[PDB]
Design a protein around this ligand. Structure first.
Ligand code: SF4
Length: 83
């Protein structure tokens, strides 16, 4: 079950960025974002994921203030975690 503050499918920014809480149900291949082959991309290896926010599989994303994403998710702003 998603937390009460999970990013949901009807969130305008989630629609615009094609977020899904399950990267296997995402369009990461189509987007071909740079940094890793697309099948390897998900929130856990994204620069915007905030490991000190949330709990368990539900963590922060800088782009979704006040919400939680799933570490196994993806959106089109995926960027390699470089630091
Ligand atoms: S920016 Fe990164 S951490 Fe945030 S939802 Fe998109 S892929 Fe996940």
């Amino acid at each position: 079950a998603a937390p009460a503050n999970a990013v949901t499918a009807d969130d305008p920014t989630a629609i615009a960025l094609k977020y899904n809480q399950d990267a296997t149900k995402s369009e990461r291949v189509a987007a071909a974002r740079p940094g890793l082959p697309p099948e390897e991309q998900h929130c856990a290896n994204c620069q915007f994921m905030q490991a000190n926010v949330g709990e368990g599989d539900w963590k922060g994303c800088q782009l979704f203030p006040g919400k939680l994403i799933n570490v196994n998710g993806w959106c089109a702003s995926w960027t390699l975690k470089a630091g």
